[PDB]
Design a binder for this molecule. Structure first.
Ligand SMILES: C[S@@+](CC[C@H](N)C(=O)[O-])C[C@H]1O[C@@H](n2cnc3c(N)ncnc32)[C@H](O)[C@@H]1O
Length: 311
């Protein structure tokens, strides 16, 4: 788990306090919080069934403390209200964004470039069987739409040629597997551009990394989810409570940053139907009183920790 010591330090859990871990994952951070101070109450949320079941298991060892919840950031306000949690309650809220170890290390879920699997990439697992997969997306969207997703969400300078390769490839055989898609991405580049470039095979610099990241953000609606989750975090924090967020990508970091600065960002309800249908989101992009005390910004890894005290 990322920056566990710093997370627990920034949260500073004390006796009698109440916490929300919005990204329970494998439970790494929640367990570290409990080891620091066990006389707490902690709501453990995740959109992934696999993570939620680990939170339920943990609640069997810590029945006084843990309340496990299955849901998206966008569902968290409803979940908390139905659980009786009032606004202004939490001493701390944690958001460790992105993928869990379970999502990355289970080839069948289709998140990673190491091992081949179905091009699934849905964080919700089997919860929403009609939720579009990454395979659905690359097989259905026209060339301009795919290029826009890669450019906007992946910040992929080569979005057009990669999109062109995807559309050419799918006309031969549908794109259904992660390594199949990675090979298609690499195929967009002439040999002289990539020959003997071992970095383009390395874990975090793989030639298909940005493409996979763009598809993950789109498939899981991560930018709108994040903004909604941050607003919910602020509403349910009490004054003096701490928000701690870990970002790993330029767009989500910019969203957290602007949120903590009190800068307004795009609400979908303010976009015309045409805009919501035909354009990619500008959340986190360059040209899209005091509520916080900003108490930490630290980096390791793409990791960036931002912590703030609600005023
Ligand atoms: C980086 S892992 C968190 C790891 C965790 N802190 C630990 O120690 O194991 C991110 C988790 O947040 C969840 N997640 C990502 N976006 C979400 C969203 N919009 N709503 C609810 N859960 C989300 C993922 O399913 C994943 O389990």
């Amino acid at each position: 788990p990322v920056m566990v010591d710093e997370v627990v330090h920034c949260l500073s859990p004390q006796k009698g306090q109440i916490f929300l871990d919005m990204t329970f994952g494998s439970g790494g951070h929640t367990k570290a919080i409990l080891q620091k101070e066990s006389d707490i109450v902690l709501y453990a949320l995740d959109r992934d069934p696999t993570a939620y079941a680990l939170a339920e298991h943990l609640s069997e060892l810590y029945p006084k403390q843990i309340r496990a919840m299955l849901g998206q950031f966008s569902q968290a306000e409803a979940l908390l209200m139905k659980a009786g949690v009032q606004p202004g309650t939490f001493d701390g809220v944690l958001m460790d964004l992105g993928c869990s170890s379970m999502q990355l290390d289970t080839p069948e879920r289709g998140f990673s470039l190491r091992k081949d699997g179905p091009l699934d990439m849905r964080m919700d697992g089997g919860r929403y069987p009609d939720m579009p997969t990454a395979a659905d997306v690359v097989n259905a969207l026209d060339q301009q739409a795919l290029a826009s997703i890669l450019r906007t969400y992946g910040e992929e300078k080569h979005a057009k040629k990669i999109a062109s390769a995807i559309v050419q490839a799918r006309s031969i055989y549908p794109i259904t597997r992660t390594q199949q898609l990675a090979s298609i991405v690499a195929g967009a580049f002439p040999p002289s551009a990539i020959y003997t470039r071992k970095d383009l095979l390395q874990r975090s610099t793989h030639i298909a990394t940005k493409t996979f990241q763009a598809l993950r953000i789109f498939v899981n609606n991560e930018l709108n989810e994040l903004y909604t989750g941050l607003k919910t975090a602020q509403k349910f924090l009490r004054p003096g409570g701490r928000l701690v967020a870990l970002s790993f990508h330029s767009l989500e970091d910019r969203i957290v940053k602007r949120f903590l600065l009190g800068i307004s960002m795009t609400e979908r309800f303010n976009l015309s139907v045409r805009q919501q249908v035909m354009k990619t989101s500008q959340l986190g992009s360059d040209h899209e009183p005091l509520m916080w005390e900003l108490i930490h910004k630290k980096v390791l890894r793409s990791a960036k920790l931002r912590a703030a005290i609600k005023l």
